[PDB]
Ligand binder design. Structure first.
Ligand SMILES: [Mg+2]
Ligand SMILES: [Mg+2]
Ligand SMILES: [Mg+2]
Ligand SMILES: [Mg+2]
Ligand SMILES: [Mg+2]
Ligand SMILES: [Mg+2]
Ligand SMILES: [Mg+2]
Ligand SMILES: [Mg+2]
Ligand SMILES: [Mg+2]
Ligand SMILES: [Mg+2]
Ligand SMILES: [Mg+2]
Ligand SMILES: [Mg+2]
Ligand SMILES: [Mg+2]
Ligand SMILES: [Mg+2]
Ligand SMILES: [Mg+2]
Ligand SMILES: [Mg+2]
Ligand SMILES: [Mg+2]
Ligand SMILES: [Mg+2]
Ligand SMILES: [Mg+2]
Ligand SMILES: [Mg+2]
Ligand SMILES: [Mg+2]
Ligand SMILES: [Mg+2]
Ligand SMILES: [Mg+2]
Ligand SMILES: [Mg+2]
Ligand SMILES: [Mg+2]
Ligand SMILES: [Mg+2]
Ligand SMILES: [Mg+2]
Ligand SMILES: [Mg+2]
Ligand SMILES: [Mg+2]
Ligand SMILES: [Mg+2]
Ligand SMILES: [Mg+2]
Ligand SMILES: [Mg+2]
Ligand SMILES: [Mg+2]
Ligand SMILES: [Mg+2]
Ligand SMILES: [Mg+2]
Lengths: 144, 25, 260, 67, 185, 60
RNA sequence: UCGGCACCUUACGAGAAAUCAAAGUCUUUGGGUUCUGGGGGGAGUAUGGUCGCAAGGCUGAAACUUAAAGGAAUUGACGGA
RNA sequence: GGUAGGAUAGUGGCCUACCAUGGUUUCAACGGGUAACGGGGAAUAAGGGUUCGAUUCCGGAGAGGGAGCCUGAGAAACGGCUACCACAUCCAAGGAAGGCAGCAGGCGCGCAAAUUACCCAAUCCUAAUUCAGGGAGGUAGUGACAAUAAAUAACGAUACAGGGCCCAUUCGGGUCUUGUAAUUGGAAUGAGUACAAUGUAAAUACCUUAACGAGGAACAAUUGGAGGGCAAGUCUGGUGCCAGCAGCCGCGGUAAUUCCAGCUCCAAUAGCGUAUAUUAAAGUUGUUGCAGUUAAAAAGCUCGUAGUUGAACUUUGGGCCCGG
C-alpha cells in the first residue's frame, strides 16, 4: 500500500506524520524555532546599521587570489560583531574607521558569497550617503 | 579516518567531557 | 463597549438601504422604535436615497422640523426614525402616501398608495397574552399593544389596524391558501400563499409557499407575513407582485423594453 | 457642463432652506466674522476655568496686586 | 476608517524574462500597432487570460446550465459588442481561440489608422493624445479606448482642435502672426 | 582567512585608468519612438542575417 | 499437487544502471499497515531526560561551515593482480 | 458533584457551611514557546495546498502597571476618583499637580513610518436641541506603500535604398522614398505658466479655457546588463591572480567577449536594481503525489495496547399506467 496509511479514519496519523517529517526542511525548522531573531546577527531584519571598528583585508579563497577589502562592524541595535564587504573598485577609502554604515545581507541568505570566507554581509550606505552613489561621482561624503 | 577508529577517539572524549563536569561538581 | 452603541459604520449597515460606499464614513443608525435596526428604514434613507427630496441629511432635518412626514399618522420628527415594514408614510404637501413594502429584490419599494389604504395598515401578531387586571392584549410586528382582541386571534396571524384609533378592524387567520409576504432572508419580497406548514416542535417552524408561477420556496415561519386571501391583497402590492423572475427572465424583459 | 439646480418658490423661503455658503455666494448673506477654529476652542477652555461670572475674581485679584 | 478604495493591477509579466521567441514577437506587435511598451502588450495578455479562464470553467459545466447560459452569453456579447469576436462565430469555443491582435485591432489607435485618417499608427497615437479625434462628440485622448463597433461611424476629428474646423492652430497662428509681421499690413 | 591583507592598493586600477570622456551624441527617442526604431532595425530595414541575426556585429 | 530454501532461461514489466518474477501489476500514479529519510559536515556531538555496577545504551540538537558529497555504469590509466 | 444559605440583575463552586470522591488525559490532558489578539479576509496558486491577517468592517482587551470604588439605565470608566508601585512637573519648600495605545507634535528606539495646517460643507453623532458642539469625520500639506491611465515626438519634399516595368537598351518614363542627408520644411500638442469661470465650507488641484509656451524640439529617461544559465561585443584603451567582478559555474598570472573605461548593443521603462521574508518553481514534504537493495532512509527480531484496517451474504427482476 506504498508506505503511508490510506484509510478514511487515518487523518490524524497522516497529519502527525506530516508535522514530524516537516522539520527536515531548511526553512520550516528555521522559521518555527525562530533562529532569525535568536541567532543570526541581523535579528530577522534586512538592513542593520552598525559602527565601523576596523578595515580588514580578507584573503580570497583558492583558486582565486585577491584581497577582498571588507570592514568589521559592531551593530548599533545588537552589539554583535560582523564583517561587511565593501563592494566596488575602491570604496574602502570611502568608509572610514569610526562612522556609521548601513549594511545588508549579501544575497545567499547567510552562506558567505563565493571566495570570501565568513563574510556574509555587505555595505549599502556609509554616513547614509550611499556607497554606490559615492562610487560613481554622484554624492559627496559629509565632511563634518 | 575509518569511522570506527574515529569512534574510539570520540568515546575517549565522551569519557573526558563527563569527567570534567564531575570534576567541577 | 461599556453600554449601548450610538454609531453605525457604513459597510456595517443593512445592505438593502443601497447606501454608497464612499462620500461619507458613517451610516444613519436606526433609532429605537417599532422595528428592529436591521429590519427598518430611517427617514433620512427614505427622503434622500429613495425619494430624492433631500440632498443632505440636513434637509431631512429641515423637512421633519416642519411637521411634514408622518409615520402612521403621527409626525415623528426624528431624522433616524426607524420606519419599517407595513409603515404608512404620509406627506401632506405632495399629497403622497407611501407604504413601506419589500420589492422582490429584498429592498424597500418606493411604493405610493392612496388615502383609503393609507388610513390603515397590517400587523403580524407577535404574541397573545393576558395583561394585568386580566386584560388580553396582542402584540404586532411594530410592537403595538392593542387590548381586547378577538379571542380567535392567535400568534402568526395578521390584524388590520385602524391606525387612527389603533384598533383591530378585522383579522386574517393564518391558515392554508392565504397570501404570505416573506419578510426576511434571501426570499425577502416574495408572495405566494401556501403549500402547507411543517411544525418542528422544538424551534424554527418552516412554511412552504408556491407563487403565481408555481415556484415553491420554503421559508421559516418567523419570516411569514399573511397579507390576504387567495388573490385579493389587503394592501396595494408593489410593481412586480413578488414573483422572482430569474436573471435569464430579467435580462429578457429589460431588452424587451429598451428597444421599445 | 452638468450640475444640479434649485429654484425656490420665493426668495424668502429660499433663505430659510438654503445653506449659508450658497447664500454668501449670491450676495444674499454675509459670511460671519467669527474667530478661528482653535482660537474659539482655546477661549472656551480658558473660560472652563472660571466658575461663575468672574467679576468676583476680577475684583479680588485687582485688590490683591494693588497691595 | 472608511471604505477601502479598491484597486487592481491590469497586467502581468512572463515567467521567462528573455525568450527569443517572445521578445521578437512582441517587438513585431509593438511596431505594428504602434505601441509604447510591452506593458501595453502585457495588459492585453492579462485581459485574455481572465477571459479565457472565464470560459474554461463555463465550458466545463453542462450546456443549457443557466450560469453558462447567462455568463457565457454575456461573455460573448461584450466581445461581439467591442469587435473582438466577430458577428459570426459566436461560441465559447471561439473566445478561447481569440488572440492578442484581435483586441489590438479594436484599439482606437488602430481604428484611427484603419479608418483612414491617420496615415500611421505612430501618427494615430499623436493625433489621439494631442486632443484630436472625437469618438461620439467626446474628445478621446486614450489610445486603448477600445472602440465598440457602434462608435466607428462617428469617429472623426474633434469639433474643436483643428483638422476638425473653426480655428487655425497654435504654431499656425504664430507663423501667420509672423508672416503678417514681416510682410506688411 | 587571513584578515590583514595590504589595503594600500584599493582603487589602484580606477585611478590609473586614463580618463576618456563620453562622446557627446545626438539623443535617441523615448518610449514608442524607440520601439519604432527597434522595429526597423530588426524586422523592416535589417540586412545582415548572419547565423540568425546579430544586433551587435563586432568588426573582424 | 501443497509448503519451503534456492536456482536457471527470458524480460512482458521495472530501474539511473548494476540487476530484479520481484525490486513487476507506478504520471494509465489509491489492496491494508508500521517504521525511517530530506545535500554534505558539525554529529550520533552538546545539553536535558532516561537505562546500566560501569563500559556505554535509548532519545537527541543548534550555532557555524560547505557547491558539491554520493550512486551506477563507460572509456582510459595504473596494479609489489 | 450533592444539599442549604449568602451574593447577584439573575443561572452557577460565584462564595460560604456540611457531605461524597470525583473531574481530565496517548482521540495529547497538564505543561512550555509564540517577534499569537480572533474572524471577515490577503499573497501565490492546473488541481490539492502553502504562507500571511498589528492594520479602513465585526467581536475582544487595554489606556504606565496593578487593585478598589463613586455616580449613573449603562463603567470596576481612566480626556472619573482613591491608594500603592514606577516615572515625572511647578514651588515663595509649607504644599500642589500629573497619564497623547485620541489628533497634530517632540524625544528615544530604530532598516523602518508625514502637518504643532483648514473646516463642520458632506457623513453622521450628542444635547433642553432645525441653530450649539464634534482632532468622530471631511479638506488640503508631506508622500515612487501599492494601483490606474500614458508625453518625451509626428508627417513630408531632398540624398542615396531597389522589387520592378517595355529585353531599364545602360538610369530616364511621372518609379514610389520604409533606412540613410549632427540636411530642409511647415504643421500638431501638452508639460509649464496664466484672464477667467468652475470647483470648494474657504481654498489648492483636476475638468474647461483667452494671451503665452520646442528646434540639440538642452522641454536631453532612467535603471541594470552585454562568457553560460539569459536578450545583447572574442570592438578599442588600461590593469596584470593585483585592483576588481561574479546569486551559481567561474573571469584576472601582458592580445581580459567576465575587472576599470570609451563606443556600440540588449532587457524592462517612469521605472529598475539590492537586501530579507514568503509563495510558485518543489512530485526537494508527496492527500492528490515523493524516496527507503546499492544514492539518506526497513526497527536485530518477535509479541502486543491505543490507532488504522478488515471475506461474502439479506428485494432480485418482470408486467402495467401516469408523466417533464
Ligand atoms: Mg503509516
Ligand atoms: Mg469604542
Ligand atoms: Mg484644446
Ligand atoms: Mg513449490
Ligand atoms: Mg541533511
Ligand atoms: Mg540516537
Ligand atoms: Mg548523554
Ligand atoms: Mg450546592
Ligand atoms: Mg444548590
Ligand atoms: Mg443554591
Ligand atoms: Mg502579542
Ligand atoms: Mg486574524
Ligand atoms: Mg486581527
Ligand atoms: Mg476598559
Ligand atoms: Mg448619565
Ligand atoms: Mg481603571
Ligand atoms: Mg475613555
Ligand atoms: Mg488619556
Ligand atoms: Mg498614575
Ligand atoms: Mg499622535
Ligand atoms: Mg516608509
Ligand atoms: Mg458637520
Ligand atoms: Mg481622523
Ligand atoms: Mg525631458
Ligand atoms: Mg483643456
Ligand atoms: Mg546570448
Ligand atoms: Mg582589450
Ligand atoms: Mg564596458
Ligand atoms: Mg506541485
Ligand atoms: Mg526525494
Ligand atoms: Mg544507503
Ligand atoms: Mg530485517
Ligand atoms: Mg539493522
Ligand atoms: Mg489492537
Ligand atoms: Mg465488507
Amino acid at each position: 500500500g506504498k508506505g503511508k496509511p490510506r484509510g478514511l479514519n487515518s487523518a490524524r496519523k497522516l497529519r502527525v506524520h506530516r508535522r514530524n517529517n516537516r522539520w527536515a526542511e531548511n526553512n520550516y525548522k528555521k522559521r518555527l524555532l525562530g533562529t532569525a531573531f535568536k541567532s543570526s546577527p541581523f535579528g530577522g531584519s534586512s538592513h542593520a546599521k552598525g559602527i565601523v571598528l576596523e578595515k580588514l583585508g580578507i584573503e580570497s579563497k583558492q583558486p582565486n587570489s585577491a584581497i577582498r577589502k571588507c570592514v568589521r562592524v559592531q551593530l548599533i541595535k545588537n552589539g554583535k560583531k560582523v564583517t561587511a564587504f565593501v563592494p566596488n573598485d575602491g570604496c574602502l577609502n570611502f568608509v572610514d574607521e569610526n562612522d556609521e554604515v548601513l549594511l545588508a545581507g549579501f544575497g545567499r541568505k547567510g552562506k558567505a558569497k563565493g571566495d570570501i570566507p565568513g563574510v556574509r554581509f555587505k555595505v549599502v550606505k556609509v554616513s547614509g550617503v550611499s556607497l554606490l552613489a559615492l562610487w560613481k561621482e554622484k554624492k559627496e561624503k559629509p565632511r563634518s | 579516518m575509518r569511522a570506527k577508529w574515529r569512534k574510539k577517539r570520540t568515546r575517549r572524549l565522551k569519557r573526558k567531557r563527563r569527567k570534567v563536569r564531575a570534576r567541577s561538581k | 463597549a461599556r453600554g449601548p452603541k450610538k454609531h453605525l459604520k457604513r459597510l456595517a449597515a443593512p445592505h438593502h438601504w443601497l447606501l454608497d460606499k464612499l462620500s461619507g464614513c458613517y451610516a444613519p443608525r436606526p433609532s429605537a422604535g417599532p422595528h428592529k435596526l436591521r429590519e427598518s428604514l430611517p427617514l433620512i434613507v427614505f427622503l434622500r436615497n429613495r425619494l430624492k427630496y433631500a440632498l443632505n441629511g440636513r434637509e431631512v432635518k429641515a423637512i421633519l422640523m416642519q411637521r411634514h412626514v408622518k409615520v402612521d399618522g403621527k409626525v415623528r420628527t426624528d431624522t433616524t426614525y426607524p420606519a419599517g415594514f407595513m409603515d404608512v408614510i404620509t406627506l401632506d404637501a405632495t399629497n403622497e402616501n407611501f407604504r413601506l413594502v419589500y420589492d422582490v429584490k429584498g429592498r424597500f419599494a418606493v411604493h405610493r398608495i392612496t388615502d383609503e389604504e393609507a388610513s390603515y395598515k397590517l400587523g403580524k401578531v407577535k404574541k397573545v397574552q393576558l395583561g394585568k387586571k386580566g386584560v388580553p392584549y396582542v402584540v404586532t410586528h411594530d410592537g403595538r399593544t392593542i387590548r381586547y382582541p378577538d379571542p380567535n386571534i392567535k400568534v402568526n396571524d395578521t390584524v388590520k389596524i385602524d391606525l387612527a384609533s389603533g384598533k383591530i378592524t378585522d383579522f386574517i387567520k393564518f391558515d392554508a391558501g392565504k397570501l404570505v409576504y416573506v419578510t426576511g432572508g434571501r426570499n425577502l419580497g416574495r408572495i405566494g400563499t401556501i403549500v402547507h406548514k411543517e411544525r418542528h416542535d422544538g424551534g424554527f417552524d418552516l412554511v412552504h409557499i408556491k407563487d403565481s408561477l408555481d415556484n415553491t420556496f420554503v421559508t421559516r415561519l418567523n419570516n411569514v407575513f399573511v397579507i390576504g386571501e387567495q388573490g385579493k391583497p389587503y394592501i396595494s402590492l408593489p410593481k412586480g407582485k413578488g414573483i422572482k423572475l430569474s436573471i435569464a427572465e430579467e435580462r429578457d424583459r429589460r431588452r424587451a423594453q429598451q428597444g421599445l | 457642463s452638468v450640475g444640479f439646480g434649485l429654484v425656490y418658490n420665493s426668495v424668502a423661503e429660499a433663505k430659510k432652506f438654503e445653506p449659508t455658503y450658497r447664500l454668501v455666494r449670491y450676495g444674499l448673506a454675509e459670511k460671519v466674522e467669527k474667530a478661528s477654529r482653535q482660537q474659539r476652542k482655546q477661549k472656551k477652555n480658558r473660560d472652563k476655568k472660571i466658575f461663575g461670572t468672574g467679576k468676583r475674581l476680577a475684583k479680588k485679584v485687582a485688590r490683591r496686586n494693588a497691595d | 476608517p472608511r471604505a477601502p478604495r479598491t484597486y487592481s493591477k491590469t497586467y502581468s509579466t512572463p515567467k521567462r524574462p528573455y525568450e527569443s521567441s517572445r521578445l521578437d514577437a512582441e517587438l513585431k506587435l509593438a511596431g505594428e500597432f504602434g505601441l509604447k511598451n510591452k506593458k501595453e502588450i502585457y495588459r492585453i495578455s492579462f485581459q485574455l487570460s481572465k477571459i479565457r479562464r472565464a470560459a474554461r470553467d463555463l465550458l466545463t459545466r453542462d450546456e443549457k446550465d443557466p450560469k453558462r447560459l447567462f455568463e457565457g452569453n454575456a461573455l460573448i456579447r461584450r466581445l461581439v459588442r467591442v469587435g473582438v469576436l466577430s458577428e459570426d462565430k459566436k461560441k465559447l469555443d471561439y473566445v478561447l481561440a481569440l488572440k492578442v491582435e484581435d483586441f489590438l485591432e479594436r484599439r482606437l489607435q488602430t481604428q484611427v489608422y484603419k479608418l483612414g485618417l491617420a496615415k500611421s499608427v505612430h501618427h494615430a497615437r499623436v493625433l489621439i493624445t494631442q486632443r484630436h479625434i472625437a469618438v461620439g462628440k467626446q474628445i478621446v485622448n486614450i489610445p486603448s479606448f477600445m472602440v465598440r463597433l457602434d462608435s466607428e461611424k462617428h469617429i472623426d476629428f474633434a469639433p474643436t482642435s483643428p483638422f476638425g474646423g473653426a480655428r487655425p492652430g497654435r504654431v499656425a497662428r504664430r507663423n501667420a502672426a509672423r508672416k503678417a509681421e514681416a510682410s506688411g499690413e | 582567512a587571513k584578515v590583514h591583507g595590504s589595503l594600500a592598493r584599493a582603487g589602484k586600477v580606477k585611478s590609473q585608468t586614463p580618463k576618456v570622456e563620453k562622446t557627446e551624441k545626438p539623443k535617441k527617442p523615448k518610449g514608442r519612438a524607440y520601439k519604432r526604431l527597434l522595429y526597423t532595425r530588426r524586422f523592416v530595414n535589417v540586412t545582415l542575417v548572419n547565423g540568425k541575426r546579430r544586433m551587435n556585429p563586432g568588426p573582424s
